[PDB]
Write a protein that binds this ligand. Sequence first.
Ligand SMILES: O=C(CCCC[C@@H]1SC[C@@H]2NC(=O)N[C@@H]21)NCCCN(CCc1ccccn1)CCc1ccccn1
Ligand SMILES: O=C(CCCC[C@@H]1SC[C@@H]2NC(=O)N[C@@H]21)NCCCN(CCc1ccccn1)CCc1ccccn1
Ligand SMILES: O=C(CCCC[C@@H]1SC[C@@H]2NC(=O)N[C@@H]21)NCCCN(CCc1ccccn1)CCc1ccccn1
Ligand SMILES: O=C(CCCC[C@@H]1SC[C@@H]2NC(=O)N[C@@H]21)NCCCN(CCc1ccccn1)CCc1ccccn1
Ligand SMILES: [Cu+2]
Ligand SMILES: [Cu+2]
Ligand SMILES: [Cu+2]
Ligand SMILES: [Cu+2]
Ligand SMILES: [Cu+2]
Ligand SMILES: [Cu+2]
Ligand SMILES: [Cu+2]
Ligand SMILES: [Cu+2]
Ligand SMILES: [Cu+2]
Ligand SMILES: [Cu+2]
Ligand SMILES: [Cu+2]
Ligand SMILES: [Cu+2]
Lengths: 124, 124, 124, 124
Amino acid sequence: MGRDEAGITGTWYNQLGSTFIVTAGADGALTGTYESAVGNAESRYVLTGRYDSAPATDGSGTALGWTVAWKNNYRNAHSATTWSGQYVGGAEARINTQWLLTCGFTEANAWKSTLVGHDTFTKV
Amino acid sequence: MGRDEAGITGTWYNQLGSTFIVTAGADGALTGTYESAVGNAESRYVLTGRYDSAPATDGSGTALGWTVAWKNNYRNAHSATTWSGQYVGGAEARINTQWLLTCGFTEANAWKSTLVGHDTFTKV
Amino acid sequence: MGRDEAGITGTWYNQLGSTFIVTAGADGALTGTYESAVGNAESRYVLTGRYDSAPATDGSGTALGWTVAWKNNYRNAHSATTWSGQYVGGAEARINTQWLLTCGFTEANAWKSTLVGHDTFTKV
Amino acid sequence: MGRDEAGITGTWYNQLGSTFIVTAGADGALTGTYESAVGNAESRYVLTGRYDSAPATDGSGTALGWTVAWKNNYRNAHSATTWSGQYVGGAEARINTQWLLTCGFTEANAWKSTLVGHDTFTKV
Ligand SMILES: O=C(CCCC[C@@H]1SC[C@@H]2NC(=O)N[C@@H]21)NCCCN(CCc1ccccn1)CCc1ccccn1
Ligand SMILES: O=C(CCCC[C@@H]1SC[C@@H]2NC(=O)N[C@@H]21)NCCCN(CCc1ccccn1)CCc1ccccn1
Ligand SMILES: O=C(CCCC[C@@H]1SC[C@@H]2NC(=O)N[C@@H]21)NCCCN(CCc1ccccn1)CCc1ccccn1
Ligand SMILES: O=C(CCCC[C@@H]1SC[C@@H]2NC(=O)N[C@@H]21)NCCCN(CCc1ccccn1)CCc1ccccn1
Ligand SMILES: [Cu+2]
Ligand SMILES: [Cu+2]
Ligand SMILES: [Cu+2]
Ligand SMILES: [Cu+2]
Ligand SMILES: [Cu+2]
Ligand SMILES: [Cu+2]
Ligand SMILES: [Cu+2]
Ligand SMILES: [Cu+2]
Ligand SMILES: [Cu+2]
Ligand SMILES: [Cu+2]
Ligand SMILES: [Cu+2]
Ligand SMILES: [Cu+2]
């Protein structure tokens, strides 16, 4: 059992109103679905990732990350986002992330292929 | 069958001499192992990710991403890296990425928790 | 006179309690001092940057950026931070930024040379 | 006199074929012009920045950064780029950077306001 397996598993919301539904496995796996409130997206997309299933016990956060490729049965935005961040437990648990969204572009446009941002997820 | 399922599946090397061994599934899954030539790492770590399994056919790259949590049976660096990028096919295939490495830190050190970099993977 | 010359000029505070004191020139220059509440820093450091002195008038923010090299008469942390972001006017004006902190490192450690984060500045 | 004042001052080119013309001052100032080979840009734009004028002498690079706001007498792309990186001296001197390009956008589009990339500058 990962230390924060129960704390991570569940439904999370970010500041854009997107919905992140995840299950943390005892082995460090993250599996679930993502629904983005913004951009070229509709409904749920598959996500997978990893988390540190034996974090430090000195008050540090729990490192994790996951990926969504923005293809599902409704749309294909030819892009992928990875979120990299940490789970912070407690009364108001949070997942604090930064993210990289890469679009599949021609070689001449590679310089403008990647957006960077930051999302904060909470359980309410 | 994903368009670039065969082109992605296999063993990749980046400019640091790290080894990225991946299988692309027809459904958009990436599964495999990562071995980093640098940092607080030894041997292979589980990785999972996603890729666009029906990319555009106008010469654009194929968007993808994956995560490694830096825990295995030898070490735990209490951190996770996500790579976000695109697969570029052809005679000298490449996966061009940018990445975010987040460490699990205390709340007071969250400002210095995340490194950013860029890795280029080739098949030789 | 830049459109937001008066709105930008002045004293700003971020969520870490750092102090950003800036003057915007009519030509697009930013000049001032930065005092960081965290890290290897003490007192004020010179900053310089640029801003869009004729922004759009459709409600968009005003793009800007600036650099601090972390050397002053007290300390030298052999590093530089650049903030890239936008000034958002109104009752609760804000400068929303993302930033890159690069340390001068040996060639073998270049992969871990750059931190990424995000700072929000307000006038109170 | 900054340690790398002479090594930095001059004309640099990146992998896109952009031209970075800079003067390093003894006080740590960077001043000059930037001409981008790509994007919504034409001719030269003002740049300003800072560099560590007393770097370590253990083989580490010299940290620096600079900003361009993409307004000049020809065009205004309502955006700013900051480059954060290090000067690496020697036979084939280099400035290795990562950069953040922020567009002035409405509040609803702030999530897609910032591109991230990496540029390598050389003297030839
Ligand atoms: O939206 C998508 C998929 C949805 C992305 C949702 C993002 S994930 C990070 C964040 N957290 C979140 O909860 N929600 C957002 N994938 C293509 C992302 C194209 N751009 C901007 C949007 C757009 C939508 C429709 C038409 C054109 N654009 C990327 C920026 C860019 C780069 C270069 C040239 C032009 N544009
Ligand atoms: O190394 C790791 C795991 C290995 C990471 C390998 C990276 S993935 C991106 C890149 N592509 C690649 O192929 N290989 C590298 N995880 C903790 C990463 C701690 N820092 C730097 C390294 C280190 C090793 C040992 C002791 C201290 N550090 C992060 C930087 C930081 C931030 C704040 C304070 C101090 N340091
Ligand atoms: O603090 C500095 C200068 C102050 C930086 C303040 C930052 S600007 C962005 C942000 N907004 C803000 O208002 N305040 C912060 N420059 C060296 C920054 C060394 N690291 C972490 C701090 C530290 C302080 C003392 C001793 C060791 N570290 C960088 C992370 C790293 C990378 C690789 C290996 C180890 N560590
Ligand atoms: O080009 C500019 C100014 C030139 C930028 C040149 C860049 S600096 C980093 C890099 N190193 C370099 O040497 N050269 C490049 N400023 C607006 C940058 C708009 N986007 C992409 C380009 C574009 C040109 C014309 C029309 C539309 N786009 C940003 C991506 C985005 C985000 C959200 C929605 C849509 N697009
Ligand atoms: Cu430990
Ligand atoms: Cu954050
Ligand atoms: Cu654009
Ligand atoms: Cu399509
Ligand atoms: Cu790249
Ligand atoms: Cu440090
Ligand atoms: Cu305009
Ligand atoms: Cu922001
Ligand atoms: Cu470290
Ligand atoms: Cu020193
Ligand atoms: Cu670099
Ligand atoms: Cu777009």
